[PDB]
């Protein structure tokens, strides 16, 4: 999650519209549980983060 958040911040550096908050990221992560258990959670986190914050990019 730290690595992903750093990547999103680097995205936000390039264009003023691409910024990212921390509450937004935390809520996106929280939405994982509602929808090797640790590996499943990690995979779900990646999928949810992508499908959440890809629509905000060109």
Coordinates of C-alpha atoms in Angstrom, one line a residue:
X1 CA 0.0 0.0 0.0
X2 CA 2.9 2.4 0.7
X3 CA 4.4 1.7 -2.7
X4 CA 1.1 2.2 -4.5
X5 CA 0.4 5.5 -2.6
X6 CA 3.9 6.7 -3.5
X7 CA 3.2 5.9 -7.2
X8 CA -0.1 7.8 -7.1
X9 CA 1.6 10.8 -5.5
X10 CA 4.2 10.7 -8.3
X11 CA 1.3 10.7 -10.8
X12 CA -0.2 13.7 -9.1
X13 CA 3.1 15.5 -9.5
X14 CA 2.8 15.6 -13.2
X15 CA -0.6 17.2 -13.6
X16 CA -2.7 19.2 -11.2
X17 CA -5.8 17.0 -11.8
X18 CA -4.1 13.7 -10.9
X19 CA -3.6 14.4 -7.1
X20 CA -4.6 11.8 -4.6
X21 CA -5.7 12.1 -1.0
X22 CA -5.1 9.6 1.9
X23 CA -8.7 9.3 3.0
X24 CA -9.7 8.4 -0.5
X25 CA -7.1 5.6 -0.6
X26 CA -8.1 4.3 2.8
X27 CA -11.8 4.2 1.8
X28 CA -10.9 2.4 -1.4
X29 CA -8.9 -0.2 0.7
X30 CA -11.8 -0.5 3.1
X31 CA -14.1 -1.4 0.3
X32 CA -12.1 -4.6 -0.2
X33 CA -13.5 -6.5 2.7
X34 CA -17.2 -5.7 2.1
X35 CA -17.1 -7.1 -1.4
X36 CA -3.4 -17.6 1.9
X37 CA -6.0 -15.1 3.1
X38 CA -3.3 -12.4 3.2
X39 CA -2.5 -13.0 -0.5
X40 CA -6.2 -12.8 -1.5
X41 CA -6.5 -9.5 0.4
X42 CA -3.4 -8.2 -1.4
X43 CA -4.7 -9.2 -4.8
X44 CA -8.1 -7.7 -4.0
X45 CA -6.4 -4.5 -2.9
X46 CA -4.5 -4.2 -6.2
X47 CA -7.7 -4.9 -8.2
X48 CA -9.8 -2.4 -6.3
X49 CA -7.2 0.4 -6.3
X50 CA -6.7 0.0 -10.1
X51 CA -10.5 -0.1 -10.9
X52 CA -10.9 2.9 -8.5
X53 CA -8.2 5.3 -9.6
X54 CA -7.8 4.4 -13.3
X55 CA -10.9 6.3 -14.2
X56 CA -9.3 9.5 -12.9
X57 CA -6.4 9.3 -15.4
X58 CA -6.2 9.7 -19.2

